[PDB]
Write a protein that binds this ligand. Structure first.
Ligand SMILES: C=C(C)CCOP(=O)(O)OP(=O)(O)O
Ligand SMILES: C=C(C)CCOP(=O)(O)OP(=O)(O)O
Ligand SMILES: NCCC(O)(P(=O)(O)O)P(=O)(O)O
Ligand SMILES: NCCC(O)(P(=O)(O)O)P(=O)(O)O
Ligand SMILES: [Mg+2]
Ligand SMILES: [Mg+2]
Ligand SMILES: [Mg+2]
Ligand SMILES: [Mg+2]
Ligand SMILES: [Mg+2]
Ligand SMILES: [Mg+2]
Lengths: 339, 339
């Protein structure tokens, strides 16, 4: 629990991030709206990505080099990752027609916001580079960070494209829901920005810029990302919204979920037809019918066994590729992800 | 007409831009969608911003330094500006609830596209930095260009925020439609990316990176941007869609248009009430009523006089601040904008 006490210290730095980003009186009204956007969307999460930057920074840099300004740049780059997340989620909730996020109504669903949330999400993305310029402009890793935040956006956007193309509204897409398709979607849409980006940001900030070390870390982190998305898909249906903070839509949205991939792999010809007639539709009785089929195929028990096989697999990859990084960097993140 | 012959040469370079951006078989389907997005949204315009990069590059660099690779980087940076435009317009058409753009139906209005256009617009933005990396990575102006494309996005997004905040759907906002408000909106939402960004990109590519020269060029270019937006607002209502390629929505969208600012400045107490009761609403009879009031206040004649006063003003600013740049750089763009 290296991030447990570090959680409140990280959140305490948000007020300054806002003050700096909310510092030309003509654009006053727009700046007031940006503060309102930041406060609604970048707060309320677990901050696992933002904290990973800070915790990984501390574990990779010698304390004699961890000065007040150096640490300030670490929390700031941590909050840049949280703004990247906030950008993706504001937009993903519109495209996934979501209702709630982190225990409250979706920013676009708020009266008086609507489709203006599209520009609001883009302002969240713009703020990353605004922060990187304000704090990392003179640093030798400045361009490496910008290129890493830009590349992470492209990877995710390419992943979202795959996600939306495999899930067309109104079209039976069971033929597309394969294991190979699934692994490509989750690698691009989640695994790069959620696991590779926070550790790589800390690595570049610690002067670790070698291609081999970044490739070795990536081998561990992308496999961890694959599990986090399988867990996210499992919780979309079998998770408690009081804990998850959001309401699942994967069945209604005809999404290439891990569960439907597992359903199709185990379904009898009769069970496939029930799935065909009820998947990808808005009717509650159809969604209920799909959830009834999943429970009949013991997919929650199939997920339990997967979590164990996956945990053992990621641990074998940490033993294989962690060096010369402290294994604590990868274990702390494994601890946050597995329960 | 320094861009007239240069138009077809610029468009001929698009096929390679697509081939390079559409060059991991797993993401094949997403890459096919990106090509479809590029071909629908980055083609059909006048390409004035993209051509300005190329024409300004030619006029600022000595021909002995204008090699095949150097020129290739110029057309590519020109197409980066066209992709920035395509990103903003795909998103602006959703938020402005537009029907057509460049003679065809809006990408989001297309059956099977919808709100997925949000991710499509973000992929267009991602492509800029993908291109800048592929062609300008080794150049000394690489970071200056990235920072200029990022800063231009923020400026525009801050401008769009002002634009949407001044135009709330369902609220009478005539008190907000002032000359001071108007000049702030158009400076941020249009003037920076449409006029400063193409010339500044060429300036950095020509090794002109001095703050004073960039400030002097900005003085001319932002004032030119203010006129281009006044002309855009005028054409929203009094322009021919066969020429403009789009259908005006400013009255229905309760936008802080130059015309409504001019209406309010000249309206009798009785005329103000007709505007109050009919502006910002979707009913055709209400929009017709507003257009009838504008024509009664001779706003098309008021625009004619403004275009002349503005032309004389921008020409005085070129005489004042053009040096040491060739005046041809600013005159060619003035020629494209004024008619
Ligand atoms: C990409 C994933 C699977 C979904 C959201 O991530 P988080 O679970 O980290 O959400 P927040 O804590 O930031 O709200
Ligand atoms: C920002 C302005 C005022 C609107 C669109 O610009 P253009 O008139 O340049 O549009 P395209 O030629 O690119 O279609
Ligand atoms: N990966 C971003 C958002 C998600 O994880 P979320 O379940 O909406 O939070 P998705 O399932 O849409 O991929
Ligand atoms: N500036 C971007 C788009 C516009 O010019 P357009 O008239 O929609 O092309 P707006 O009037 O919305 O500002
Ligand atoms: Mg989602
Ligand atoms: Mg999604
Ligand atoms: Mg999910
Ligand atoms: Mg518009
Ligand atoms: Mg607009
Ligand atoms: Mg307009």
């Amino acid at each position: 629990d290296v991030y447990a006490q570090e959680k409140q210290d990280f959140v305490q730095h948000f007020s300054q991030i806002v003050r700096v980003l909310t510092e030309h009186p003509e654009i006053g009204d727009a700046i007031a709206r940006l503060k309102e956007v930041l406060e609604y969307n970048t707060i309320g999460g677990k901050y696992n990505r933002g904290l990973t930057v800070v915790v990984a920074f501390r574990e990779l840099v010698e304390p004699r080099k961890q000065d007040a300004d150096s640490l300030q740049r670490a929390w700031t780059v941590g909050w840049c990752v949280e703004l990247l997340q906030a950008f993706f989620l504001v937009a993903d909730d519109i495209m996934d027609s979501s209702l709630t996020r982190r225990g409250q109504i979706c920013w676009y669903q708020k009266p008086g916001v609507g489709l203006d949330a599209i520009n609001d999400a883009n302002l969240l993305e713009a703020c990353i580079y605004r922060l990187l310029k304000l704090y990392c402009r003179e640093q030798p890793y400045y361009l490496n960070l910008i290129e890493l935040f830009l590349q992470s956006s492209y990877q995710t956007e390419i992943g979202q494209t795959l996600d939306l193309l495999t899930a067309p509204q109104g079209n039976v897409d069971l033929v597309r829901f394969t294991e190979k398709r699934y692994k490509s979607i989750v690698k691009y849409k989640t695994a790069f920005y959620s696991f590779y980006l926070p550790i790589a940001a800390a690595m570049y900030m610690a002067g670790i810029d070698g291609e081999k070390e970044h490739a070795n870390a990536k081998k561990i982190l992308l496999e961890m990302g694959e599990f986090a998305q399988i867990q996210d898909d499992y919780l979309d249906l079998f998770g408690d919204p009081s804990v998850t903070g959001k309401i699942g839509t994967d069945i209604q949205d005809n999404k290439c979920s891990w569960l439907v991939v597992q359903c199709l792999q185990r379904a009898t010809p009769e069970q496939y037809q029930i799935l065909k007639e009820n998947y990808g539709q808005k009717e509650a009785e159809k969604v209920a019918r799909v959830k009834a089929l999943y429970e009949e195929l013991d997919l929650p028990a199939v997920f339990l066994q997967y979590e164990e096989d996956s945990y053992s697999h990621i641990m074998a990859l940490i033993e294989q590729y962690a060096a010369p990084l402290p294994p604590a960097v990868f274990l702390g993140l494994a601890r946050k992800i597995y329960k």
